[PDB]
């Protein structure tokens, strides 16, 4: 009740909010909206490393926004046969892609981060850092 000392005790909605630019200042320099593309041939491997990345970010207080899978590209590899001169033979492969979006960074945290990411790189794992604009 407005007249009382206890007014607004139940007030909550400012606590829970239920209702993009990199900021470069040259001294406090926040470079955000960054895309981590983890691409590898093995399903389990890419998933495990994407997982490791995700968890690493959550522990480092680095804010992850979106973690999602990119469409798999199916490769058909045509190998030359020696007997028949121009004769082709085939083997089937698949390329798997995962994505982890981080919303903020600083110079020092970029430097630190990349060290850990590439140091812990598993075999047959291709890593990419890019900018938020991409077209699915």
């Amino acid at each position: 009740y407005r007249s009382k000392p206890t007014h607004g005790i139940g007030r909550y909605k400012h606590l829970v909010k239920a209702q993009v630019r990199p900021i470069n200042l040259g001294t406090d320099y926040e470079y955000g909206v960054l895309n981590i593309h983890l691409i590898a041939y093995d399903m389990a491997l890419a998933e495990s490393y994407a997982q490791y990345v995700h968890n690493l970010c959550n522990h480092l207080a680095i804010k992850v926004e979106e973690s999602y899978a990119m469409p798999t590209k199916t490769m058909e590899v045509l190998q030359l046969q020696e007997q028949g001169s121009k004769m082709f033979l085939d083997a089937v492969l698949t390329t798997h892609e995962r994505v982890v979006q981080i919303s903020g960074l600083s110079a020092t945290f970029a430097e630190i981060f990349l060290e850990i990411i590439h140091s812990n790189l598993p075999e047959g794992v291709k890593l990419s850092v890019r900018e938020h604009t991409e077209e699915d």
């Binding site: 110079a107 020092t108 970029a110 430097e111 060290e115 590439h118 140091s119 075999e123």
Partner: protein, 217 residues
């Protein structure tokens, strides 16, 4: 308070080939193999192995093996690159091709007029220059080599001050993509070295704390 300006560089070689596994990691790898193959659904190869192993017993009384042996011989015939290009030499610390498993770092030998210097490669930057530009410049110029090395940040790795005057040593991290070393037999002593060896060859307390921001792996 005069300030002596010296840039510096920590040069990281990429570990090339993966490491062997800890006994625990190996037993765990075994377990993961077993349990993975335990929940697994059929196989195409195993459908054609088992269904035909069963159906041929019904064509006798009333393939898979070929493929197996084929792949066996095609694998066995083929041979692979050596995991050790270091210990077959066992000598060179100065070879850039030395260690496949770990990350390697560059050291240099200098004896100056008043001094004896074992040196993590150092730069000298004029006040008008950026620490970055002098890092790169000193890198490409000093080693007499063509190096593609992707740098990470515009921010430096670690800093150590020697005040006689006052002075600064600012170490940067450079990630080596592909180096081309010209005059592989040059007199200047360039030592490509791991973590333990970086602990060994380093006298100073300025270079002793470089293994503090180094990646131990």
């Amino acid at each position: 308070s005069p300030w002596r300006l010296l840039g510096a560089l920590c040069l990281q070689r990429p570990p090339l080939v993966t490491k062997p596994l800890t006994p625990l990691q190996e037993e765990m790898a075994d377990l993961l193999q077993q349990i993975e193959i335990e929940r697994s659904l059929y196989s195409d190869h195993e459908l054609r192995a088992l269904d035909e192993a069963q159906q041929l017993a019904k064509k006798k009384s009333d393939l898979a093996q070929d493929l197996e042996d084929m792949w066996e011989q095609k694998f066995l015939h083929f041979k692979l690159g050596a995991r050790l290009t270091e210990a077959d030499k066992k000598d060179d610390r100065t070879s850039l091709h030395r260690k496949l498993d770990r990350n390697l770092i560059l050291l240099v030998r200098e004896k100056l007029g008043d001094q004896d210097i074992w040196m993590l490669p150092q730069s000298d930057w004029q006040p008008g220059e950026t620490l970055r530009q002098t890092a790169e410049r000193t890198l490409a110029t000093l080693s007499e080599n063509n190096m593609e090395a992707k740098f990470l940040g515009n921010a430096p790795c670690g800093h150590y001050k020697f005040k006689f005057l006052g002075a600064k040593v600012f170490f940067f991290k450079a990630l080596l993509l592909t180096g081309d070393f010209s005059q592989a037999g040059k007199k200047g002593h360039h030592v490509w070295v791991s973590k333990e060896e970086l602990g060994d060859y380093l006298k100073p307390k300025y270079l002793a704390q470089v293994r503090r921001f180094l990646l131990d792996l």
